[PDB]
Every structure is written in structure tokens, then in C-alpha cells.
Paper text:
Dinuclear monooxygenases mediate challenging C–H bond oxidation reactions throughout nature. The protein components of AibH1H2 stem from a largely uncharacterized structural superfamily, PF04909, containing over 100,000 unique proteins that can individually function as either carboxylases, hydratases, hydrolases, or monooxygenases. Representatives of the latter enzyme class—collectively defined here as “amidohydrolase-related dinuclear oxygenases” (AROs)—include PtmU313 and AibH2,9,15 which employ dinuclear cofactors with different metal identities. Each of the four candidate AROs can harbor redox-active diiron cofactors.
Each of these proteins was fused to an N-terminal His6 tag, recombinantly expressed in Escherichia coli, and purified as soluble protein preparations. For initial studies, the expression medium was supplemented with additional FeII sources to ensure the formation of an intact dinuclear active site. Aerobic samples of these Fe2-metalated proteins were found to exhibit moderately intense UV/vis features centered near ∼350 nm, consistent with charge transfer bands classically associated with diferric FeIII–OHx–FeIII motifs. These features were diminished upon anaerobic addition of ∼1.2 equiv of sodium dithionite (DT) and returned following reexposure of these samples to air.
Residue numbers in the entry:
A (entry chain B), B (entry chain A): 5 to 351
Write the structure that this text describes.
């Protein structure tokens, strides 16, 4: 039926205290997790309506409330819990960041993935010190309910550059796709959140996040990341879709004239993207004619690259029934179930 | 029959010396114009085949050769000379950058615009000091063959922010569209050239230029530049087309949820763009099925915002007969002549 590839479980900073190494544990006990936020005030908060659990705190913080509202509410075969901790990549201390990710991966294993069969996990790593991220991927990637690695797209340079390759080597060797998720662009020591620098308000910052993915993606393709690690899968989570055709054409046209500068590439850039990359659908783009979005998919044979997600319980939550309704049934099968069942090797 | 809204006349740095005050003249005579280039080496170079004039200098440097090879080799009724000096916005000294722009505008008027009727020009200004740019727009904007202002997309912050508004105010007051053109991104004291920072190779830098336009465009709309200045037209020159619809759909969707934060907006973001912005066609996007580009246009009704340009004499130059052969005649007339004729009020 349905696999949701982006479900944000949440937790009080103090939920990680039992899993944190010293000195980082004492830090969090005294001040919470030193997240270095983007600094763009959204007024509609982040969460949707009536997702705050009974008695609980943050929306998404109660496994039982989420089994009910999401797993059985919308009949989901599997849900990939992606948490929020990958955002710590924006902070300044590489060891603090890795230690927080390490404690979260354990917490997720101990307290979430065993509470339902549908529950699967993205392991989080910090990108400031890619060597520590490789360690964590090898430490914990073997767990049978851990199906991918989650990275923030708030980095210190384009993600295709060699400083990061230890992460791709480790994930590809383990068979774990690398998911990339926005949220922290511009915070702490990451790069400016848009090519033109820092916008003034949240609506600009949010709209522009897709452009970070385009930059990172051009870097990963042209730096030959997929030539160097032919087993790598990259999943672009929550960054839009409709921009991909134009990027594909622009990048292919430049490649035709510029191939000699990038000789490790032996097929067109668009084919590397199609063969190695996936994109989640949330927040689904809404042309006035919904048929248009589908026409866009078909223009670049992207039905095998698209993964449904709800992004429960955020304000732009996508219920599966209302998304992509004019899709052929065989394409709807692929985007709602089969692409992800294959990608994560589920069942 | 045809109007070409982006043609790069070139000149020897030394050609500005008669228009330059000291100490600027002495610097140019000794060291050329201090362009802070992208620092990305193009192996082809920025120039076309067989465009180097007889015995003359750079391709595009000779009015009579250009009149022959371009203005009449293709049956252009008007060509908008845009030069390359607007790239000087990347440099560190605002007074130097303004003087350079002022000397170029004087040179363009005296040595180019009168040498043929099809010649129309784009006054250039430096963005480091928008007050000096406003003064230059008022000095020169009234000339009968000056049809627009030209600024570089390599800025120190998103171009919709209030720091730049004196430019838009002066252009609108003189009935001049404001054109934006890539080329200097990341040079000197401008912002990093992509949202992810600095890529390693020309092919990435060039591909990602569209994203700079996307960020500036979202800035101008959301900062209410088209509400503050309701008689302002903006021309996105040489930055692609196929990304527009996904941007229009993402922005409109966020607008619906976030309109309270941006109350000066009393219409959908997509509609400010449709009513205030144009985009040149070069470099024409080349999908496998050239129909897919046109299908893309009609999804957003963009036939009224697209302006043909050849971008002579660059490597990704576009010959008129070759681009958009699939267009309906009425759409072709608009894109190749009618949009530009109305915009610049020619004839
Ligand atoms: Fe998400
Ligand atoms: Fe979200
Ligand atoms: Fe140009
Ligand atoms: Fe060019
Ligand atoms: Na920063």
C-alpha cells in the first residue's frame, strides 16, 4: 500500500541524556542541545493542528499517539523516522555534533524502532568531521531497522567535494542510501542559506531551500561522487521536484560543451541523477492545473525516482489521499510504495 | 522581425581612458579594469567561433563587423548592447566601480549607439553604492537610445533588500527596466556563488547561475519591490527559463500559508512575476523533446515574459532560426519581437 519516507519523530532534549557520553551529556543537561537554528521565525509554528499528543509535549514526540494518528490512521506499511537531530551539522564543535548524533541513533533504536514493525530509521550523522560520521555509520548502520543515513543540507561547502567522501564511502559500502534534509541553512557556521546571501523573512528562506539541493546535487554529480562510489543512493528529502527538469537540461547542455573538464563522467549528468537519486514528494507542488506537475514528471522519466512522504506532523503535511490524484495507477504504485520498498529493501 | 535583448559589445580596457578621471584613468592604463572575476577557468573561453573581427581585438569589439556579422547577417531590427562592465560590481571600491560604469556609459553613447539605428543600449551601474548608481541613472537615463539599466547578479546581499532600492526608484522614475545579468558571482566581495558555497569547476559554477536569479527574484517579490515601485520592470537576462514554474508554484503555496508575514502582497507572488518580470531565452534549454520546453512555457503562460537574445558572441550563442522552432507563430512573434518592442517602447 503506502511507505512514508519522511516522518519526524521528536523528543525533549533531555530524552538523550541517558545515551550521551561525557562531557556532552552534562552540557545538554545544563542547556539542552545547542542547535544553531536558521533564525527565521515561522509564525504558524512548524507543526500541524491536533498533532500535539495527549499530555505530551512536541508534536511527534509520542510513539503511541503516532502509531494511532499516522501508522493506522493512514494505513502505512512502513514509515522512515528521520527525527530532527541531523540539523546539528550547523553547530561549531565537530565532536559535540557527532556525539549528539550518536546518542540520538541509540535513543531511536532503544525507544522507537522496536515499538512497531512499520517503524524504520534514518541514522543521523554530523558533516563537520566526516571521519566521525563514517565511524557512526559503521557502528550502527548494521541494525536491521536502520535503512538510511540522514544528512543536513546545511553544510560548510558543496557536498560533492572530497572533504565529505568518507560519509558516502561508508554509507554506500553498508548499502545505506544517504538522505539530505533542509532545516538549518545559514545557522551557526554553515554557508549562507541562498546564493544571494541571507533573506529577510521565513517565506524567502523556506522557498529558497530547493536551491541548496540544486547546488549540492550539481556538486555531487560533477565531482564524480557517483563514479567514485557506484553503490551510492542519494535521497533529496523535502526540497521540491519541479525544478529537476530544468536543472537536468541545463547541466546536460553544459556537459556536452564541457565534458573534457570532467572526464571521470562517462554518461550524461541527467543519467547519473536518474540512476542514483530519489526525491520525496512533500511538500507536493500545486500547479493550478494539477495535471501539469505530472506532465513535468513524465518529461524526465522520474516515476521511478519519486518517494511519497507526508512530513507528519509539520504544517505542510501531505495526506496520501490528496496527493498526486491524477496519477496512472501503475505510477501511483511506484511513487507510494514500490520505489521505496526497493530502495530500502523492505519485507 | 527580430529584436535581440542581450548582445555583448566588447572593448579594450584602454578604450575607457578618455572618459575616466584620475586616479581611475591611471589605474586602468597600468593594470586594466580591475575586474574581480569568478576565478573559474573556461577551457573553451567565453567566445564563439569566427567572431574575431579583422585585425581588431576581442570578439564583439568592432561596430562595423558586428553590424555585418550580426545586425544584418541575422535580420535584426534592434539589438540591445549590454557590454560587460556591469560585472565590476564585484570589486571593493564603490567609487571606482561607479566611475568605471560612468565612463562606459559615456563611451557607449559616443562610439556605439550612433553607429547604427538598430543599436540600443543598457546603462550600467555598480551596486556597492546604490546612491551613486541612482545618480548615474538620472545623469544618463534620458538618452533616447538608452532603453534599460543593467546590473550584475553578483551582489552583496539579496537584490530585493532596501539597500538597493535607490536603483529601482531611479530606473522606474526614468522609465527604464532594470536588467540583471550573471558573470561575476563569487568574485571579489560578492556573496558565495551558490547556496552551498564555492564549487570546484566552471561547469558547476555556470550551471548554478540560475539559482542566483531564483534567490534575487524571490527577494524582490517578497520584499515588496514591485509594490513599492509598481511601475518597475525587471529583466532576468541569461539565467534560464525552465526553473520558473516550479519556483512560481513553490512561492504561491508558501504565500497561501504565510501571507500574514508579507501583507504588502495583495496578489499571488506568481502574479507579480508574470506582470513585472521578463526572461531572455539564451541559453535556450534543450530537452530531448524540444516540445517539452514549450509545454513548460504554456503551463505558466510565459509567452508574454520571454525575450529572445542571441548572446553574441559567446560559446553558448543562439542563432534565431534554431531556437523554439516549435512555437506557434503568434507566440514566436511575441518572443522574438513584440514583447521587447513593447517593453522598450521602440519604433
Ligand atoms: Fe521532513
Ligand atoms: Fe518540514
Ligand atoms: Fe549575455
Ligand atoms: Fe554569455
Ligand atoms: Na554562518
Amino acid at each position: 500500500k503506502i511507505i512514508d519516507v519522511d516522518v519526524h519523530n521528536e523528543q525533549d532534549d533531555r530524552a538523550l541524556l541517558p545515551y550521551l557520553q561525557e562531557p556532552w551529556r552534562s552540557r545538554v543537561a545544563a542547556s539542552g542541545i545547542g542547535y544553531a537554528g536558521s533564525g527565521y521565525y515561522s509564525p504558524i509554528g512548524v507543526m500541524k493542528k491536533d498533532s500535539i499528543p495527549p499530555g505530551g509535549g512536541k508534536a511527534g514526540s509520542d510513539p503511541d499517539y503516532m502509531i494511532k494518528q499516522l501508522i493506522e490512521g493512514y494505513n502505512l506499511d512502513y514509515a522512515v523516522l528521520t527525527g530532527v537531530v541531523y540539523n546539528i551539522s550547523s553547530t561549531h564543535d565537530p565532536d559535540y555534533a557527532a556525539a549528539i548524533c550518536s546518542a540520538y541513533n541509540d535513543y531511536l533504536i532503544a525507544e522507537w524502532l522496536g515499538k512497531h514493525k512499520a517503524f524504520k530509521g534514518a541514522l543521523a550523522v554530523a558533516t563537520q568531521d566526516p571521519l566521525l560520521a563514517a565511524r557512526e555509520i559503521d557502528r550502527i548502520g548494521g541494525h536491521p531497522d536502520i535503512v538510511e543515513v540522514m544528512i543536513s543540507s546545511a553544510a560548510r561547502s558543496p557536498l560533492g567535494q572530497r572533504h565529505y567522501h568518507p560519509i558516502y564511502e561508508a554509507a554506500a559500502r553498508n548499502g545505506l542510501p544517504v538522505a539530505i534534509h533542509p532545516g538549518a541553512e545559514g545557522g551557526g557556521s554553515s554557508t549562507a542559506p541562498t546564493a544571494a546571501g541571507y533573506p529577510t523573512r521565513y517565506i524567502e528562506w523556506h522557498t529558497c531551500l530547493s536551491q541548496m539541493f540544486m547546488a549540492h546535487l550539481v556538486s555531487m554529480v560533477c565531482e564524480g561522487v557517483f563514479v567514485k562510489y557506484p553503490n551510492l543512493k542519494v535521497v533529496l528529502v523535502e526540497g521540491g521536484v519541479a525544478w529537476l527538469p530544468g536543472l537536468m537540461w541545463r547541466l546536460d547542455k553544459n556537459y556536452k560543451a564541457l565534458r573534457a573538464t570532467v572526464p571521470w563522467l562517462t554518461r550524461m549528468p541527467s543519467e547519473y541523477i536518474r540512476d542514483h537519486c530519489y526525491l520525496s514528494t512533500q511538500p507536493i507542488e500545486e500547479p493550478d492545473n494539477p495535471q501539469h506537475l505530472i506532465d513535468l514528471f513524465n518529461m524526465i522519466d522520474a516515476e521511478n525516482m519519486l518517494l511519497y512522504s507526508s512530513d507528519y506532523p509539520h504544517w505542510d503535511f501531505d495526506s496520501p489521499g490528496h496527493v498526486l490524484r491524477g496519477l496512472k495507477p501503475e505510477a501511483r504504485r511506484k511513487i507510494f510504495y514500490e520505489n521505496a520498498k526497493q530502495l530500502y529493501r523492505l519485507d
